[PDB]
Amino acid sequence: SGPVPSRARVYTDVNTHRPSEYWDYESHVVEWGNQDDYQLVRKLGRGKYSEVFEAINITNNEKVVVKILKPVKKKKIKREIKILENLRGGPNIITLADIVKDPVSRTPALVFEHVNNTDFKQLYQTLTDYDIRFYMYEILKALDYCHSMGIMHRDVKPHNVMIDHEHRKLRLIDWGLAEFYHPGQEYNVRVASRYFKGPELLVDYQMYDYSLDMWSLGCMLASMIFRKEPFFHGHDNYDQLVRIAKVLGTEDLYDYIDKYNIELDPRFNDILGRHSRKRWERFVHSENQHLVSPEALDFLDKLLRYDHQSRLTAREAMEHPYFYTV
Ligand SMILES: Oc1cccc2ccccc12
């Protein structure tokens, strides 16, 4: 009679005991300042619904980042602004400094604190075993904080992790896919980048929680310690699950779908196959052995699990021996 329900093991009722104003983003009143206080300097990047610029606040001569959001869908922006305002000031959370509109275009624009980002492809080659442990712990601080605030990022990936390595500063950015956790709520599974999508989304199990973020974090850790980017290299959403199965075996996938009474899409019939559970040590090679340790492997094993309930919470992850040196 449908799928078996599930709930978060931590911060389960944090939003339930909160007033609706905190999580009712649809009712949140957004007030837009004048963009004339900001002078655009140069374009930094371009997203599907966003153009990002480096800018100067002409009232204090401070550099900022301006995200000109394309009004593809309102409420989503309301959701992102409400979440950004709720988390504003939290450890390693990007600071939303202002919300503005250009007088002529009337285009919505989010103003963030400036982060002097080190290129990922440049970072990935200079980071030591210590650096990986350090930055993973910084990400866990941001995740345990937003989960405690009843929020799941739902888009954890390297490009959403901004690091100023010189200043050892880290920020979790892009909260446009983030959502408020409400126990028993069925969410849209079309979230996260393919490589970091958790098995719950690929099997279309809508009653997921903060643990989705812990799966994505595990994908990042695996790519970093094994120097294989991405780790689960799917070519589509269907193939992505097949790639997870090629490492965690097809036995636990059926155990997981049976535990939650999940109906597998017929598209999986001819592509899924039969696979065995691999030892994490099989991914160790000469090029990555300086980043691997029994602690790192035990920690990874406890994040990359089919069962979202069985994964370490961000708070449990922070207590792992892998972080004793931080
Ligand atoms: O050093 C790292 C550790 C964990 C995650 C990272 C994400 C981006 C760039 C570097 C990272």
Residue numbers in the entry: 2 to 327
Paper text:
CK2 is a pleiotropic, constitutively active Ser/Thr kinase with one of the largest sets of target proteins of eukaryotic protein kinases. Previously, we have used a fragment-based approach to discover a new, cryptic pocket located next to the ATP site, termed the αD site.
The original fragment screens that led to the discovery of the αD pocket identified five fragments which bound in the αD pocket. X-ray crystallography showed that fragments 2, 4 and 5 bound in both the αD site and ATP site and so were of limited use for probing the αD site.
